[PDB]
Design an enzyme around this catalytic site. Structure first.
Site, PDB file in Angstrom:
ATOM      1  NE  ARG A  50      -3.132   0.855   3.237  1.00 63.80           N
ATOM      2  CZ  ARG A  50      -4.151   0.607   4.048  1.00 63.80           C
ATOM      3  NH1 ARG A  50      -5.367   0.381   3.564  1.00 63.80           N
ATOM      4  NH2 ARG A  50      -3.940   0.580   5.352  1.00 63.80           N
ATOM      5  CG  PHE A 107      -0.218  10.286   4.729  1.00 61.99           C
ATOM      6  CD1 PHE A 107      -0.174  11.477   5.444  1.00 61.99           C
ATOM      7  CD2 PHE A 107      -0.353   9.098   5.429  1.00 61.99           C
ATOM      8  CE1 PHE A 107      -0.260  11.477   6.818  1.00 61.99           C
ATOM      9  CE2 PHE A 107      -0.442   9.090   6.816  1.00 61.99           C
ATOM     10  CZ  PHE A 107      -0.396  10.270   7.506  1.00 61.99           C
ATOM     11  CD  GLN A 116      -0.354  -0.357   5.945  1.00 64.59           C
ATOM     12  OE1 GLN A 116      -0.912   0.730   5.856  1.00 64.59           O
ATOM     13  NE2 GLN A 116      -0.931  -1.416   6.511  1.00 64.59           N
ATOM     14  CG  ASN A 170      -2.886   0.404  14.970  1.00 65.32           C
ATOM     15  OD1 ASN A 170      -2.144   1.127  15.650  1.00 65.32           O
ATOM     16  ND2 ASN A 170      -4.068   0.804  14.562  1.00 65.32           N
ATOM     17  CG  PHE A 181       2.366   3.787   8.458  1.00 66.50           C
ATOM     18  CD1 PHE A 181       1.852   3.125   9.583  1.00 66.50           C
ATOM     19  CD2 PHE A 181       2.370   5.176   8.439  1.00 66.50           C
ATOM     20  CE1 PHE A 181       1.346   3.834  10.673  1.00 66.50           C
ATOM     21  CE2 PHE A 181       1.867   5.913   9.526  1.00 66.50           C
ATOM     22  CZ  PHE A 181       1.352   5.239  10.650  1.00 66.50           C
ATOM     23  CG  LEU A 187      -1.724   9.074  11.689  1.00 65.57           C
ATOM     24  CD1 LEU A 187      -0.826   8.333  10.708  1.00 65.57           C
ATOM     25  CD2 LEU A 187      -3.106   8.424  11.753  1.00 65.57           C
ATOM     26  CG  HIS A 193      -0.901   4.433  13.777  1.00 65.94           C
ATOM     27  ND1 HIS A 193      -1.088   3.190  13.218  1.00 65.94           N
ATOM     28  CD2 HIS A 193      -2.017   5.144  13.497  1.00 65.94           C
ATOM     29  CE1 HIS A 193      -2.264   3.142  12.629  1.00 65.94           C
ATOM     30  NE2 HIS A 193      -2.848   4.316  12.780  1.00 65.94           N
TER      31      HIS A 193
END
Length: 174
Positions: free
Chosen positions: A63, A68, A71, A110, A121, A130, A134
């Protein structure tokens, strides 16, 4: 302090893109860094639940989100639904001390509170929203350009690179 360095050699459709070197903040997140380091080296064996090698070698960046993050780390299913930690299954959120205050921090992906496995990521922009969700445990200190090359690759409707982004080699440095 007692910070260690780890690397990922990445290929895009078989062609080497370069090396991503990350410094693990072992002093702030010892369990999380220990998990990541062991996954880079394969030195913890097989997953208790999945029975599969706790190893990033050969897994992919499944991903990527333009502007941004990228991952990866899903060594069991290769699509975001798998992965496992060296502690067996998932482990708890260790600390929320380290934050997403800069681009290129390494953070744990997660599926809710205390569901850390092997997926992670790397951001390319600050992401304070975040924080407290995370666990941030490291930073890219070299190869930031490899991260951005992967991030801007063309993807399908599910944010999956059309190209095969593979962690060809991985391990520890210093």
């Amino acid at each position: 302090k007692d910070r260690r360095r780890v690397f990922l050699d990445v290929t895009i459709d078989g062609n080497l893109a370069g090396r991503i070197v990350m410094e693990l903040y072992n002093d702030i997140a010892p369990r999380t860094c220990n998990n990541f380091l062991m996954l880079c080296t394969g030195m913890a064996g097989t997953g208790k639940i999945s029975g599969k090698p706790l190893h990033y070698k050969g897994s992919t960046f499944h991903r990527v989100i333009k502007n941004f993050m990228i991952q990866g780390g899903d060594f069991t299913k290769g699509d975001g639904t798998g992965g496992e930690s060296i502690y067996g299954g998932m482990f708890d959120d260790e600390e929320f001390v380290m934050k997403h205050d800069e681009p290129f921090v390494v953070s744990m992906a997660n599926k809710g509170p205390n569901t850390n496995g092997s997926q992670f990521f790397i951001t390319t922009t600050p992401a304070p929203h975040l924080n407290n969700i995370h666990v941030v445990f490291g930073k890219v200190v070299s190869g930031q350009e490899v991260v951005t090359k992967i991030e801007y690759l063309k993807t399908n409707s599910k944010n999956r690179p059309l190209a095969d982004v593979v962690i060809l080699n991985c391990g520890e440095l210093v």
